[PDB]
Design a protein around this ligand. Sequence first.
Ligand SMILES: O=C1[C@H](c2cccc(Cl)c2)CCN1c1cncc2ccccc12
Ligand SMILES: O=C1[C@H](c2cccc(Cl)c2)CCN1c1cncc2ccccc12
Ligand SMILES: [Cl-]
Lengths: 302, 298
Amino acid sequence: SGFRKMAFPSGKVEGCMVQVTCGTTTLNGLWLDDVVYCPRHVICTSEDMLNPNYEDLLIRKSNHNFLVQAGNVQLRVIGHSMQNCVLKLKVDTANPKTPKYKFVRIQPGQTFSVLACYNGSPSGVYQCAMRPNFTIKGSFLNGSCGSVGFNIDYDCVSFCYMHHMELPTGVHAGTDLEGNFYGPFVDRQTAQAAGTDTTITVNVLAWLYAAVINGDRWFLNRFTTTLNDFNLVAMKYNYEPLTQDHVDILGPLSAQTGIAVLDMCASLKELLQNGMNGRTILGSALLEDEFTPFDVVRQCSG
Amino acid sequence: SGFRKMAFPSGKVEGCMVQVTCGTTTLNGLWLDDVVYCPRHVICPNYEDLLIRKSNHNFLVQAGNVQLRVIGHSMQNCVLKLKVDTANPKTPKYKFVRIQPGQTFSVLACYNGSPSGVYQCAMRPNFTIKGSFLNGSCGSVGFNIDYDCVSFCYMHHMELPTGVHAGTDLEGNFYGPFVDRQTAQAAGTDTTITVNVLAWLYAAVINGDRWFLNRFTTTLNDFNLVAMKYNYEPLTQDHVDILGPLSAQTGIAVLDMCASLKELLQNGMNGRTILGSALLEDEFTPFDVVRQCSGVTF
Ligand SMILES: O=C1[C@H](c2cccc(Cl)c2)CCN1c1cncc2ccccc12
Ligand SMILES: O=C1[C@H](c2cccc(Cl)c2)CCN1c1cncc2ccccc12
Ligand SMILES: [Cl-]
């Protein structure tokens, strides 16, 4: 019993964190086999940050300009290449702690663990979701660039995020491990803003099923709804549309609890209308949207 | 910017998790040097009588895909110590520490000696933890990291009828009035960790959330009267002193923040949130707020 915002054990990712220094800039790198991955903006000063021509800045660099530090050992950079917004620093030593890994690009609503790092040293681990507006509500200070987001289903680490930037609202933007940004963001200081954020509906429903599995049923009602009427109501509370894919994905939780997805949708409609009335659901007074249907099954069943 | 419930990096603890099997029971063990620590209910009650009947080979200890050989066994309070022939090469610098209610720690939840998740939590004033544990999680540990030293503070033993959890420090002493036996046991009435709520209000101020601040201050005695009425732990002079750095950083005296908390308790949030929460969060200590809002590494 119990329901916690749970991150994956970070050990496999900790053994990959390194410090990358370029001139005055110091940030984090991910050392896998003989390559160190890091944000390409490590080659920028902060003055050439408004409109940097990364190809032009990178061609002027030599391998010895990049100082890579893995613990108290300086790694030797033997090559460099840029792939989208990530810099790939070929080093002369393969990381002996390299876990089984994959680079996966995630979709909005997906969750992952973040190993926040400063100077190549892990300081904390927390659980995140990719918001529908492609930002993450992280906890990052200056120096955290290059910190990574991941999932560890089974023994394979799936890297899905690399931190690059903080937007003016305090939210964060970054790329997959191929250097492609999530969202319409660019790695430059031009005026950028997170789009209006919406609640991840399928995740809220999964969390309502988690509460039912944990013995809480107060919010359930005798009503059902059509998928269209649910979405017409959902949109008015800035909730993401619920697709037939999401209804299908919620199938196992529906079968386990005996509450049809559209029946749980009618509970959600009622909660949106009434609020909680001094009550909580899984120790929360707000509807939680950073647990996917997959997270709920993993945590509640194994 | 941002404020998350953040756990310590679990790597140093992952290298210590093993699976302990005895009879039909399978649970987790903590392998440090040549000893595996696990709950004594794995033998299970007269635990001295049950243990004397067990031989070393009855305990099957598995570290990954390698079976460890048990060369001795002894009991210390509600913890069983299984001497093994091999010292754990991944043994970090560590200490066994007993924590106080209100202190926080990271839990590395495990099943079959394999770490499955890490979460942060606090020792409640009623000595329970609001954890997330299924059957098979016994022996999962709670810890903090101080520089490069892992301080083990908790070992999971059981789940109470309300879904909350009870366990021991690594010396086998239970937190709370609990016993490791199937009997009627209930978590006592819980209270809110006042010093932690204040630390979280300072974290919200540091993050740009000031709506709850007011011009008022209060005496410590008047605040404790209000706090007692709302099932909040008494705020001591030690807690006021501990909150000093955050008070100096934000420019809001501890008793000034106490007057914000009093108004929040009497009037509610009024549809507003603080750090994305509609409830007052009490599972961040003043040290956790300083560590996160200043980026300390391990
Ligand atoms: O946002 C940025 C900077 C930046 C600027 C423009 C484009 C890029 Cl790709 C990156 C680089 C550091 N950084 C930060 C990243 N995360 C958290 C932070 C907190 C407080 C100050 C800064 C922070
Ligand atoms: O509470 C117990 C049992 C127990 C019984 C008597 C004495 C002791 Cl010390 C412990 C052993 C397993 N266990 C659990 C431990 N944590 C979470 C759980 C969740 C769901 C079911 C069980 C759980
Ligand atoms: Cl995805």
